[PDB]
Amino acid sequence: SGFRKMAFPSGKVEGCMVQVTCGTTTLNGLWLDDVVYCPRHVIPNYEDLLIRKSNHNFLVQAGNVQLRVIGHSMQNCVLKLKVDTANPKTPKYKFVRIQPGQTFSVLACYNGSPSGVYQCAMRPNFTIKGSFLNGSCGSVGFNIDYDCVSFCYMHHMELPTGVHAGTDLEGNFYGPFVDRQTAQAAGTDTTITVNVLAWLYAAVINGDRWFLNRFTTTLNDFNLVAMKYNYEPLTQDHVDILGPLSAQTGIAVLDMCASLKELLQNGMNGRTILGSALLEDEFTPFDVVRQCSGVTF
Amino acid sequence: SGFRKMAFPSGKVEGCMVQVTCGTTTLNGLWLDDVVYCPRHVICTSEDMLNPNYEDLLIRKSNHNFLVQAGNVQLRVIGHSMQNCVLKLKVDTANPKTPKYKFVRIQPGQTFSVLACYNGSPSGVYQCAMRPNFTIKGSFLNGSCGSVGFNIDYDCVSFCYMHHMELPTGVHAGTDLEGNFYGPFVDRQTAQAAGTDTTITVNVLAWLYAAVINGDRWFLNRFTTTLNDFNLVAMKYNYEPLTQDHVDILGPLSAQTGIAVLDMCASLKELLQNGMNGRTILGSALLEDEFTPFDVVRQCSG
Numbered sequence: 001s002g003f004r005k006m007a008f009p010s011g012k013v014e015g016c017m018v019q020v021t022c023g024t025t026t027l028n029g030l031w032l033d034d035v036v037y038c039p040r041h042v043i044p045n046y047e048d049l050l051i052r053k054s055n056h057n058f059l060v061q062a063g064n065v066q067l068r069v070i071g072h073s074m075q076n077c078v079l080k081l082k083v084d085t086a087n088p089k090t091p092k093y094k095f096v097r098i099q100p101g102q103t104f105s106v107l108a109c110y111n112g113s114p115s116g117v118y119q120c121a122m123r124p125n126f127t128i129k130g131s132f133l134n135g136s137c138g139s140v141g142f143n144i145d146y147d148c149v150s151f152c153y154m155h156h157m158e159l160p161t162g163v164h165a166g167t168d169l170e171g172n173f174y175g176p177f178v179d180r181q182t183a184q185a186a187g188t189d190t191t192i193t194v195n196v197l198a199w200l201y202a203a204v205i206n207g208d209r210w211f212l213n214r215f216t217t218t219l220n221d222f223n224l225v226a227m228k229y230n231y232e233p234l235t236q237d238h239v240d241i242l243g244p245l246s247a248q249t250g251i252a253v254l255d256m257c258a259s260l261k262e263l264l265q266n267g268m269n270g271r272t273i274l275g276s277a278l279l280e281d282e283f284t285p286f287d288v289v290r291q292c293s294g295v296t297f
Numbered sequence: 298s299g300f301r302k303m304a305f306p307s308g309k310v311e312g313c314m315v316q317v318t319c320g321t322t323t324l325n326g327l328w329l330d331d332v333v334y335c336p337r338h339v340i341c342t343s344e345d346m347l348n349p350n351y352e353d354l355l356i357r358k359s360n361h362n363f364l365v366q367a368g369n370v371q372l373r374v375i376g377h378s379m380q381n382c383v384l385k386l387k388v389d390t391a392n393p394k395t396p397k398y399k400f401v402r403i404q405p406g407q408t409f410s411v412l413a414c415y416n417g418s419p420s421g422v423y424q425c426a427m428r429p430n431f432t433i434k435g436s437f438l439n440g441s442c443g444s445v446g447f448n449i450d451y452d453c454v455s456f457c458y459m460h461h462m463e464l465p466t467g468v469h470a471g472t473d474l475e476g477n478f479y480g481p482f483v484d485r486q487t488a489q490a491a492g493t494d495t496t497i498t499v500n501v502l503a504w505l506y507a508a509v510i511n512g513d514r515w516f517l518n519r520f521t522t523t524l525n526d527f528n529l530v531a532m533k534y535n536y537e538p539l540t541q542d543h544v545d546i547l548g549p550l551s552a553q554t555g556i557a558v559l560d561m562c563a564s565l566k567e568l569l570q571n572g573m574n575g576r577t578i579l580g581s582a583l584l585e586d587e588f589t590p591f592d593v594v595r596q597c598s599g
């Protein structure tokens with residue numbers, strides 16, 4: 001029993017964190033094989049700024065060992081520093097771009113040193129509601145599938161609202177953001193509907209049933225109600241994804257939708273679900289299965 | 298900016314997780330140097346649950362009864378001893394991945410990270426607080442026994458918890474790494490109930506200071522309170538009494554934000570009286586009590 005916002009074990013990613021210093025800026029790098037990846041803002045015309053840099057300008061530190069940079073290239077908003085040594089601790093990895101609603105773990109680092117791990121969701125407005133201080137740039141978001149680390153995020157900046165913006169590991173920003181000091185605002189956020197439903201299934205698996213009702217709804221009637229409460233549209237794909245949870249608990253997806261519809265129009269009435277007074281949307285349907293069945297890494 | 302329930306990086310602890318099998322029972326072990334630590338109930342049978350004699354059960358075991366597996370390598374048990382409710386299996390190989398570590402017993406209200414494992418394999422990491430009733434509200438399934446709670450302050454891992462059992466309410470009970478249970482709990486399947494839980498007041502206040510540091514001020518009021526008047530109100534809402542030690546501990550946050558502890562106490566008194574009124578504090582509609590004053594300073598400063 002129990003439901004917690006659980007992150008993936010961070011060990012495979014900790015073995016990749018390095019400190020990258022260029023001039024006055026110090027941030028984090030992801031050392032995989034003989035390449036160190038980091039935000040290009042460590043060096044604006046970035047092609048022009050990068051052509052003025054030499055390999056010895058970037059001081060890369062892996063623990064108490066200095067890595068010598070033997071090349072540098074830029075891919076979108078990510079800087080790739082070719083180093084002489086391949087990271088022995090390099091795990092089986094992939095660079096994956098995630099979609100909004102998808103969750104991932106963040107290993108927050110300061111000076112190439114991991115200090116915390118937390119679980120995040122890519123908001124529908126493409127920002128993450130992270131926890132970052134100055135120096136966290138280059139910190140990475142990841143998932144683990146079997147023994148493979150899927151790197152999906154690199155932290156680049158904090159928006160004026162305290163939310164975070166970054167890129168995938170190929171340097172492509174999530175959201176309409178740019179890596180420079182200018183007026184940039186996060187768009188109006190919406191609730192990840194499929195994730196709230198998955199979390200309602202997790203509450204039922206944990207014995208919380210007060211919100212369940214005898215009613216069902218059509219997907220269209222649910223989406224008309226969801227739109228009114230700033231909830232993301234629930235697609236037929238989402239229903240199919242929720243299928244195993246629907247089968248396990250005996251509550252049809254449109255039947256849980258009718259519970260969610262009532263929860264939105266009426267509220268919780270001083271009641272809680274999994275110790276929360278808000279509807280939680282940072283657990284995907286897969287996260288609920290993984291946590292409520294026991295998958296290990 | 299931003300406030301998250303953050304766990305310590307689990308890598309140093311992952312390098313210590315092993316699988317311990319004794320008969321039909323398989324649980325987790327913590328392999329540090331040449332010793333594997335695990336709950337002593339790994340040696341219990343079906344009829345040795347209600348009233349087991351662990352000294353008697355352990356004397357009947359030989360080193361070859363304990364199958365210890367570290368990854369795909371079997372470790373050779375060369376000795377066994379029991380310290381309170383933990384079993385110590387001396388092995389023939391010292392763990393190369395053994396970090397700089399300490400065994401620390403924590404007090405209620407204290408937080409720690411839990412590395413949940415099944416079959417000696419880490420599957421997730423989450424943040425926990427030792428509840429005032431000495432239970433933890435964890436997320437554990439069958440096979441999680443032997444999973445550990447820790448804090449990684451600087452480069453040293455302070456092991457503070459080992460999971461042992463789930464109480465009838467879905468809450469969890471375990472020991473420190475010396476085998477001493479937290480609370481009035483025993484490793485027997487006898488009727489055991491967690492005591493009435495209370496809110497860790499000092500932690501809610503620390504989290505209110507975290508919200509102020511993050512720009513949230515709506516809950517602040519023009520009032521202050523005496524420590525006694527605050528406790529008289531706090532008790533009525535099942536909040537732990539706030540001691541002078543707690544007031545002292547909140548001192549740095551009080552100095553950083555400019556809000557006196559008894560002033561922040563009057564804000565908490567009002568929040569208990571009024572509720573949130575459809576508002577949130579740090580994205581939460583409930584008062585959060587699993588962030589200690591030390592957690593708030595570490596996350597909001599470094």
Ligand SMILES: CCc1cc(Cl)cc(CC(=O)Nc2cncc3ccccc23)c1
Nearest residue numbers: 001338437438439461462463484485486
């Ligand atoms: C009542 C008998 C008993 C006494 C003792 Cl000394 C130990 C256990 C084992 C136990 O509680 N294991 C588990 C841990 N966490 C969560 C669990 C969820 C489901 C099933 C087991 C779970 C059981």
Ligand SMILES: [Cl-]
Nearest residue numbers: 402403404407
């Ligand atoms: Cl403590």
